Ligand binder design. Structure first.
Ligand code: HEC
Ligand code: HEC
Ligand code: NI
Ligand code: NI
Lengths: 106, 106
């Protein structure tokens, strides 16, 4: 959808992952998070409306989603190994990506 | 100084900023962190000793310090413009940079 919908999706599924106790639930939530992050990367945040596409600010904004997606992919691999707790710990650590982008651009 | 020397400097001074009794101590600690990070950026982590200066792992390692230096510079700017409580709040967010790189390479 749009950036507000993608953001609550990300937040909702972090909670799902912390709640869960098996690999399938974690995998499903991470998969949902991955789609939301890639969709949000296409948007321009309101505080960067007139910035150029390759501007330093737009570059760092887009890079933040690439990096979030990379670490979602890393947590997905752990869940696919049956390493539930390690996948959950990796998911919890995604909050650093949320907070970093927010402090720049939210 | 080698890598774990720089890491001790980063660890000690991040704690100084949180506990500092005055603003001059915040700036001085941020300055020491910045120097340690730029030195550490020129190191090879032991888990990557088998990688070239061009490996994707060495690239992400170097970029982590670039980004940490940028955010130290942001906090230094707050401190230099007299907004030292804001600089302290920004320094607290630096721990995510530590945790992210450690997740990969520590
Ligand atoms: C940039 C690279 C971001 C990353 C990574 C994450 N978010 Fe985000 N978020 C971003 C912006 C620019 C905004 C402002 C939206 C606006 O239209 O002003 C937000 C906002 C949120 C919100 C609030 C939703 C709202 O309608 O205001 C939430 C709940 C949120 N973000 C959650 C969130 C989480 C949990 C993230 C990590 C998993 C995350 N975001 C990453 C930009 C970016
Ligand atoms: C990569 C870009 C890193 C960033 C950013 C930070 N650290 Fe780090 N740290 C990194 C590596 C590769 C290692 C292992 C070094 C080794 O030779 O094994 C470390 C290690 C530490 C340690 C342990 C020190 C030791 O004697 O082994 C500490 C206390 C430490 N790091 C602290 C630290 C802090 C507080 C950081 C943020 C401010 C931080 N590091 C960033 C790689 C990276
Ligand atoms: Ni990473
Ligand atoms: Ni940044």
């Amino acid at each position: 959808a749009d950036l507000e919908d993608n953001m609550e999706t990300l937040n909702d599924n972090l909670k799902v992952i912390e709640k869960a106790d098996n690999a399938a639930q974690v995998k499903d939530a991470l998969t949902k998070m991955r789609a939301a992050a890639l969709d949000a990367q296409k948007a321009t945040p309101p505080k960067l409306e007139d910035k150029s596409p390759d501007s330093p600010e737009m570059w760092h904004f887009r890079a933040g989603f690439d990096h979030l997606v990379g670490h979602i992919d890393d947590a997905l691999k752990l869940a696919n190994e049956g390493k539930v707790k390690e996948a959950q710990a990796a998911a919890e650590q995604l909050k650093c990506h949320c907070n970093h982008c927010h402090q720049h651009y939210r």
